[PDB]
């Protein structure tokens, strides 16, 4: 079984924000309920509504307004739109279902603003200078979060760390994400980050070789 | 539905975490609780008061006395690091969910390795001078970063941020970028951070000279 959020990253104010469930592995008429739960950044966890086997659906009373929650049987999937949002509905928005213990999808963020999409520029972190170095990417000026970061496509995971990304005054986002090696290793293995910003459809392998000093 | 922000302890130690609700969400409902390891959705690790779902370890455990009730986990262990929800229905039996405990681990102190990054060439042909500070694998998570230039005192143009405890030694990394022109890193020599952290003795200094690498 696995749920999985799908909708845009970033909703203008005013606009509906509409996302999906995509349910696999299990039919979505033999559910029992389907609901979404939101979580704004840094914060605790808010339910937004549910649907039963019946159709019948409930509502937080503060959201009720603006809320609709549907199944689609064929497409498998459900579906939450809320209208007329602000930035108080910018939040990882995670759906759930119960098929004794519910399934989570993996959340995706909605970020409302009126600053529009723009894809990073990844600039390397080249290692330099006890037996151990770090290198690392930059992945500079993306609107709006997230954007994820891999190494070597998933093979290189110890001794990784991908930071929280920062907000910078000019209004876009920044990030860095590192890895410490054997120094010995520089001459002879390859090290790439794979930096991938779904709301931009920009997707960057970038080798980060060492620096002539 | 109130819990305290946080909760630490040394691993193999226990630890409690309390909601307390009132009598018409606890005191006539069932109690949940959830683990959120960073970047993942809500686990469920208890339902009705204090079951465990398959899979989850007795370790953690719960259990309701009037309005409050309390998640307990032995055996702390690195990876126990998350933020634990508690969540019960409401009086118009809709989900509610406390804040949310962050769990820290009371590891050993461990200073900081410190590496500094120059701008890359490619960065700054567009304009642009990001010099990062990387601290990794310290602890606890106090730490300061000083930006120097040419023995400047750099106030103001520079962001950090930290990553989670770790899941395999519980240490925090923090990345600090200290953002100059091209033109103004072209008018001077010596970039230094200084890093003062409890695990050193003295304050550490990694530092460049612009156009060495």
């Known amino acids: 079984v696995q749920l999985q959020e799908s909708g845009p990253g970033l909703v203008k104010p005013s606009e509906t924000l509409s996302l999906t469930c995509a349910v696999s592995?299990?039919?979505?008429?033999?559910?029992?309920?389907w609901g979404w739960i939101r979580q704004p950044p840094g914060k605790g966890l808010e339910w937004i509504g549910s649907?039963?086997?019946?159709?019948?659906?409930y509502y937080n009373p503060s959201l009720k307004s603006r809320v609709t929650i549907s199944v689609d049987t064929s497409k498998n999937q459900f579906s939450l739109k809320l209208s007329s949002v602000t930035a108080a509905d910018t939040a990882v928005y995670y759906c759930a279902g119960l098929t004794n213990d519910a399934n989570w999808g993996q959340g995706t963020l909605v970020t409302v603003s009126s600053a529009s999409t723009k894809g990073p520029s990844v600039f390397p972190l080249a290692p330099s200078s006890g037996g151990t170095a770090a290198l690392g990417c930059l992945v500079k000026d993306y609107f709006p979060e997230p954007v994820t970061v891999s190494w070597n496509s998933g093979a290189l995971t110890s001794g990784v760390h991908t930071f929280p990304a920062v907000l910078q005054s000019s209004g876009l986002y920044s990030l860095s994400s590192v890895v410490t090696v054997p120094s010995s290793s520089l001459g002879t293995q390859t090290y790439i980050c794979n930096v991938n910003h779904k709301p931009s459809n920009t997707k960057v392998d970038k080798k980060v070789e060492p620096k002539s000093c | 539905l109130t819990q305290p922000p946080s909760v630490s302890a040394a691993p193999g130690q226990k630890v409690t975490i309390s909601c307390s609700g009132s009598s018409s969400n606890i005191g006539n409902n069932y109690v949940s609780w959830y683990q959120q390891l960073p970047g993942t959705a809500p686990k469920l690790l208890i339902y009705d008061n204090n079951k465990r779902p398959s899979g989850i370890p007795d370790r953690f455990s719960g259990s309701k006395s009037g309005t409050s009730a309390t998640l307990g986990i032995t055996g702390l262990q690195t990876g126990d690091e998350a933020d634990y929800y508690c969540?019960?229905?409401?009086?118009?039996?809709?989900?509610?969910f406390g804040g949310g405990t962050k769990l820290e681990i009371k590891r050993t102190v461990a200073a900081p390795s410190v590496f500094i990054f120059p701008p890359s060439d490619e960065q700054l042909k567009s304009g642009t001078a990001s010099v990062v500070c990387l601290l990794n694998n310290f602890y606890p998570r106090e730490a300061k970063v000083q930006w120097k230039v040419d023995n400047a005192l750099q106030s103001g143009n520079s962001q950090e941020s930290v990553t989670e405890q770790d899941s395999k030694d519980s240490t925090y990394s923090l990345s600090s970028t200290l953002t100059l022109s091209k033109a103004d890193y072209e008018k001077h020599k010596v970039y230094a951070c200084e890093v003062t952290h409890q695990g050193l003795s003295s304050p550490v200094t990694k530092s460049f000279n612009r156009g060495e690498c």
């Open positions: 592995g299990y039919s979505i008429s033999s559910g029992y309920y």
């Open positions: 969540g019960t229905w409401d009086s118009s039996l809709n989900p509610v």
């Open positions: 649907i039963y086997h019946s159709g019948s659906t």
